[PDB]
């Protein structure tokens, strides 16, 4: 016994606390129901584990005890109410795979020793058939109301033995420390903090404390993962405050080019277009403003949040004198960065809630195909749409003939995206987004699209040097530009009206006209060299 012994807790409390710490680290665990501390009901994504904490005191756990029928009455014994009987009589409304687990401090006899090994390593080991028939004979071939046989209970049973309370405390505290490290990028200041978090979790489970220092429960007896995550985040930021460090907060990233007038689209609403002009500033275009706003998107587009917090962990002088050389080697490497930054910020500006940036890997005749600039949007009434983004900064030919070529290439990519039976890899790149089955069913590719074209949408950014926009402001750079971009968007209608190659896919266009993209690219190259 460790800090639980000091506080005065029992084994079941620490088992429940260990399981909620597991939920803290395990992304697949959805909830940990706990009415009493010995009847844990861990609901995981696709499974439900009934964990029962038991203990004898004589020497060990023989078979007679596990089939012994509980008294539970005034000098009477209720039939079919043994430890095994209570284990199998564990109902679950959800159609989830049932798993059973018995956790005891005391060791296990040779008769039940087959249960100790994990079911994943029982293919060739003995101890199954005779144990099954002994249990069936002692229980008179019990079949439950759900048709659960004793053999079925045997195939799903993972009796765990813990040597003492301190061992469980150590696994729980290790879980807490590791969870802090990979959920907030923060190493706990001391062991006292980890022990305090463990004690607070124990108090929450046993309800032997005060409500403020407790994991929130919408209803009692059950704890959901997001509530525990928010409570743990509060504890971790408390650590960071009391340790003298500064809490990492994502900066309010600057709003790159503001949108145009009211969005314009097609009749069938499967084609969208939104211009993103930038206003002048006293007769002169704000090239410097656009460039130094874009260069703030150096870490949101290149890096990942887990390694973005490490940037914050750098003090000012190291942050200055580490990235002195330019990570860009050519102007054809800065143009791509700018073109994808504009789209990566346009998508965020267009959505009220912040989309989740992610990448997609798809095969093509056995060869890899990478797709950066992917996003997951959270449309709760409908699901979770996947926006696949393609950038382009045309500066060689006029946009009028280039746009159909871009659309053709987009259609080839789309046919290589949503027309396949082989799996697709989705690099979530957020570390905190739980991928629900709505998208995971498309990712696995096991089933053909059942009107899944609403789940996938493709967004394309097309920046171009417009003839109308010049270095002089040319009073009245509107009206004509509105019909110009309308004619440009009309290019995303010829295939829609004439035929249905992919006419059931919603496609977004983010056309942006500039006086000169080359000057902006040169300005961004100059600005990134300053850091």
């Amino acid at each position: 016994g460790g800090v639980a012994a000091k506080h005065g807790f029992l084994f079941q409390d620490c088992v429940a606390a260990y399981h909620v710490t597991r939920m803290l680290r395990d992304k697949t665990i959805r909830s940990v129901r706990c009415e009493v501390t010995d009847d844990i009901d861990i609901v995981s994504d696709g499974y439900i584990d009934f964990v029962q904490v038991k203990s004898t005191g004589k020497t060990r756990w023989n078979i007679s005890d596990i089939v012994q029928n509980s008294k539970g009455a005034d000098k009477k014994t209720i039939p079919c109410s043994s430890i095994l009987h209570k284990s199998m009589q564990c109902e679950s409304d959800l159609s989830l795979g049932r798993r059973y687990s018995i956790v005891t401090e005391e060791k296990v006899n040779k008769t039940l020793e087959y249960l100790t090994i994990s079911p994943n390593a029982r293919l060739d080991k003995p101890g199954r058939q005779e144990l099954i028939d002994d249990l069936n004979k002692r229980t008179d071939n019990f079949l439950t109301d759900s048709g659960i046989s004793v053999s079925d209970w045997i195939d799903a049973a993972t009796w765990e033995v813990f040597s003492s309370l301190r061992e469980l405390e150590l696994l729980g505290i290790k879980n807490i420390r590791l969870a802090s490290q990979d959920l907030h990028g923060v190493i706990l200041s001391s062991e006292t903090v980890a022990e305090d978090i463990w004690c607070r979790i124990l108090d929450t489970v046993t309800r032997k404390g005060e409500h403020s220092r407790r994991i929130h429960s919408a209803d009692d007896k059950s704890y959901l993962r997001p509530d525990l995550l928010e409570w743990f985040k509060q504890r971790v930021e408390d650590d960071q405050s009391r340790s003298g460090r500064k809490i990492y907060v994502k900066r309010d990233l600057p709003h790159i080019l503001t949108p145009f007038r009211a969005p314009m689209a097609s009749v069938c609403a499967k084609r969208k277009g939104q211009v993103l002009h930038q206003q002048y500033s006293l007769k002169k275009y704000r090239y410097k403003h656009i460039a130094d706003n874009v260069c703030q998107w150096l870490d949101e587009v290149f890096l990942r949040p887990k390694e973005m917090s490490d940037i914050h962990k750098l003090t000012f002088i190291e942050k200055r004198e580490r990235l002195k050389n330019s990570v860009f080697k050519s102007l054809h490497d800065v143009s791509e960065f700018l073109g994808r930054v504009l789209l990566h910020a346009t998508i965020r500006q267009h959505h009220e809630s912040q989309p989740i940036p992610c990448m997609l890997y798809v095969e093509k005749a056995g060869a890899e195909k990478i797709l950066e600039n992917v996003h997951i949007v959270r449309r709760d009434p409908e699901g979770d749409q996947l926006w696949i983004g393609f950038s382009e900064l045309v500066t060689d030919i006029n946009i009028a003939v280039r746009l159909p070529e871009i659309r053709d290439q987009l259609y080839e990519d789309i046919s290589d995206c949503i027309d396949t039976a082989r799996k697709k890899i989705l690099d979530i790149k957020d570390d905190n987004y739980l991928l629900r089955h709505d998208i995971d069913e498309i990712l696995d590719g096991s089933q053909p699209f059942d009107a899944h074209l609403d789940r996938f949408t493709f967004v394309l950014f097309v920046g171009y040097d417009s003839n109308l926009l010049t270095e002089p402001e040319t009073p009245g750079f509107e009206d004509d530009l509105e019909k110009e971009t309308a004619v440009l968007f009309e290019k995303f209608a010829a295939d829609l009206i004439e035929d249905s190659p992919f006419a059931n896919l919603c496609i977004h266009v983010f056309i942006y006209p500039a006086p000169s993209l080359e000057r902006l690219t040169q300005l961004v190259d100059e600005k990134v060299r300053e850091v």
């Binding site: 460790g2 597991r22 680290r25 395990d26 992304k27 697949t28 994943n120 150590l170 505290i173 290790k174 420390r177 590791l178 969870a179 490290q181 990979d182 959920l183 990028g185 190493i187 706990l188 200041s189 001391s190 062991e191 150096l298 290149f302 890096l303 990942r304 887990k306 390694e307 490490d310 940037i311 962990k313 750098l314 190291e318 580490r322 990235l323 050389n325 990570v327 860009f328 490497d333 960065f337 990448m359 890997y361 095969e363 056995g366 060869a367 890899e368 990478i370 082989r422 799996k423 890899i425 989705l426 690099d427 979530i428 570390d431 991928l435």
Partner: protein, 651 residues
């Protein structure tokens, strides 16, 4: 785990698609609890790049996502601005070619902020990057790196002399003095105890702390106490990790770090053979040696066991016999049937601790070059080896004497990383792998000893007669275990007399060794392999450190007895103590032996050149470098090769 097991066990299957493997890797890297698992798979993907020649960018992105940034830098050529920038993020402050692992970066950030840091396990990540970064940030002045072995001290000294050559002055030998504000004290526990200038230390780094979790526990504890009371910051990277407590109540609030970052994938196959069953173990060695084809490191509990394993390995025809000037030198200087000699003649490399440092370096850089195939190490940390090995055969696991076990399924990956296994390593375990009073006794003896024999303890310069018996009787009581561990029995008190007479009458070390082997053959006739090992250990350890220590200890003890008994004879053993410490050389020259120059080579160097009596290791090394033309013309080829390797001279 199920997805992890499927992806891992599908690696060898014929119907293998790398895309499903990378899908499993990404799925494992999405869930935090399976982070390490995905990382493990990536390691395997880094050892089988032929299978992933098509899906290279996916593997590179998985490598970046898992936090294996050194692998991202070194195993991949075509790098985007994204991964280049994140590599520049984790780039170490001391050099532009080394980057940080994620966990290493977190620990370095903890350390550079001034907080004491304790690691939860010696991990597969090499902590040398953290120490080099701490040196390269230009904030600390005086440091104390504690290392377990003198050879490791020399390796770290070379590492910290290549970089930070002029900024820091490195003190590794007692002859050196602190003449600069910035000083790195790369010492062992005993050296730290001896040094009397350990003050104002900024940060001391200790690895291999398992001795505190005997000759290695008391010394390490005393070194810890001294460095804690002297310094202000510490960085421990060893056991005593299970929620380390005790340093908190002593006024040292650390920041104990628990990690789950493993950079090495291992396929462990066990045999369950008990240690006592030697014949079954030998048959198992035959089987594995047939199985092992790549660079194999065989862990043994003793050098004799390694010799037996090498003899059996060459009995089965494993290894390519070859000859070179080095094997000729070893045969002509040590013996013909010595374990090292035959093993090197047949392509097997013994690397036990008692081996001379020059031969240790030769074995290490022979194994690193890939010329060797079976390196038989008797310690976990092999000084000088790089990440070459692919198989680790733990011939002996239960070393005994309260040692639970090495490679406890929580140490297998860390110890394998220490041994330097390239990504995926096959661990063939013969046994089953489990989880989890010096300064006061002499005067009491001298009280009984009468005035008749008192004349044998008060000498000056040249010793007198009948001193051998008295000294043997003294050493049979002061340090019985020191002489017993080398095969020299405590009683009768005659064999120590023979050893002392052999050392005294000998003019040079080589002649002493030849006489010792010529007598060891007679002794075994009433083998020669064990004799050389014990003799080398006796000369290096007993005759070098402990026996001179007791020779100096008896001085002040006998001074009081001479004063009390009225003896006016002078007391001075500078002729005897310094001669025994000097190994038949000038007093300071023997210090180059730790550098890696053989004593036999040092004798020829002494005869050829003129050595300063009061110079230190730095002065003697600079003297050798300056007068290279004098000895390079008229010395043996192997001798000058060893000198060049030891001093770092390029051609």
């Amino acid at each position: 785990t199920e997805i992890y097991e499927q992806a891992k066990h599908s690696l060898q299957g014929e119907d293998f698609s790398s895309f499903n493997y990378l899908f499993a890797v990404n799925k494992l890297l999405s869930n935090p609890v399976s982070y390490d698992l995905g990382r493990d798979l990536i390691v395997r993907a880094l050892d089988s790049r032929e299978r992933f020649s098509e899906h290279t960018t996916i593997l590179k992105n998985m490598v970046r996502k898992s936090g294996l940034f050194p692998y991202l830098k070194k195993e991949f050529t075509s790098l985007t601005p994204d991964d280049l920038r994140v590599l520049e993020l984790y780039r170490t402050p001391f050099s532009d070619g080394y980057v940080f692992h994620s966990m290493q970066f977190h620990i370095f950030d903890l350390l550079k902020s001034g907080q004491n840091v304790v690691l939860s396990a010696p991990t597969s990540m090499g902590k040398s990057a953290i120490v080099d970064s701490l040196l390269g940030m230009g904030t600390l002045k005086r440091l104390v790196l504690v290392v377990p072995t003198v050879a490791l001290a020399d390796e770290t000294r070379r590492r910290l002399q290549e970089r930070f050559g002029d900024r820091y002055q490195i003190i590794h030998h007692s002859s050196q003095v602190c003449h600069s504000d910035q000083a790195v004290y790369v010492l062992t526990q005993e050296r730290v105890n001896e040094r009397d200038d350990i003050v104002d230390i900024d940060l001391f780094v200790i690895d291999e702390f398992y001795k505190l979790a005997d000759e290695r526990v008391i010394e390490l504890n005393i070194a810890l106490s001294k460095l804690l009371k002297v310094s202000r910051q510490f960085y421990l990277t060893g056991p005593f990790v299970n929620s380390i407590r005790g340093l908190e109540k002593l006024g040292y609030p650390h920041t104990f770090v628990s990690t789950d970052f493993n950079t090495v994938a291992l396929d462990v196959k066990t045999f369950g053979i008990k240690a006592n069953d030697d014949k079954a173990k030998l048959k198992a060695l035959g089987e594995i040696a047939h199985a092992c084809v790549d660079a194999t490191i065989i862990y043994c509990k003793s050098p004799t066991v390694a010799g037996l394993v090498a003899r059996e390995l060459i009995r089965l025809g494993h290894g390519t016999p070859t000859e070179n000037p080095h094997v000729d030198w070893v045969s002509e200087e040590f013996d013909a049937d010595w374990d090292y000699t035959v093993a090197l003649r047949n392509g097997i490399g013994l690397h036990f601790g008692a081996l001379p440092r020059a031969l240790q370096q030769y074995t290490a850089d022979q194994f690193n070059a890939g010329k060797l195939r079976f390196l038989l190490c008797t310690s976990t940390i092999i000084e000088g080896v790089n990440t070459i090995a692919k198989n680790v055969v733990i011939y002996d696991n239960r070393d005994g004497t309260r040692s639970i076990d090495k490679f406890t399924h929580g140490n297998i990956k860390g110890r394998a990383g220490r041994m330097g296994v390239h990504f995926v390593g096959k661990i063939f375990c013969l046994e089953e792998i489990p989880e989890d009073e010096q300064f006061e006794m002499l005067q009491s003896m001298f009280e009984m000893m009468d005035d008749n024999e008192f004349s044998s303890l008060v000498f000056h310069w040249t010793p007198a007669t009948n001193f051998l018996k008295t000294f043997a009787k003294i050493i049979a009581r002061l340090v019985p275990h020191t002489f017993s561990r080398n095969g020299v029995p405590v009683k009768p008190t005659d064999v120590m007399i023979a050893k002392l007479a052999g050392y005294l009458s000998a003019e040079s070390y080589s002649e002493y060794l030849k006489n010792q082997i010529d007598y060891a053959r007679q002794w075994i006739s009433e083998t020669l392999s064990i004799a050389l090992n014990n003799d080398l250990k006796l000369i290096t350890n007993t005759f070098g450190y402990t026996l001179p220590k007791v020779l100096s200890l008896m001085e002040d003890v006998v001074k009081h007895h001479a004063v009390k008994r009225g003896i006016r004879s002078k007391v001075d053993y500078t002729h005897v103590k310094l001669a025994f410490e000097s190994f038949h050389l000038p007093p300071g020259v023997n210090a180059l032996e730790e550098i890696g120059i053989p004593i036999q080579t040092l004798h020829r160097l002494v005869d050829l050149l003129e050595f300063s009596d009061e110079a230190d290791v730095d002065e003697l090394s600079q003297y050798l470098r300056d007068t290279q033309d004098i000895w390079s013309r008229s010395i043996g080829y192997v001798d000058q090769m060893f000198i060049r390797r030891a001093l770092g001279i390029r051609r």
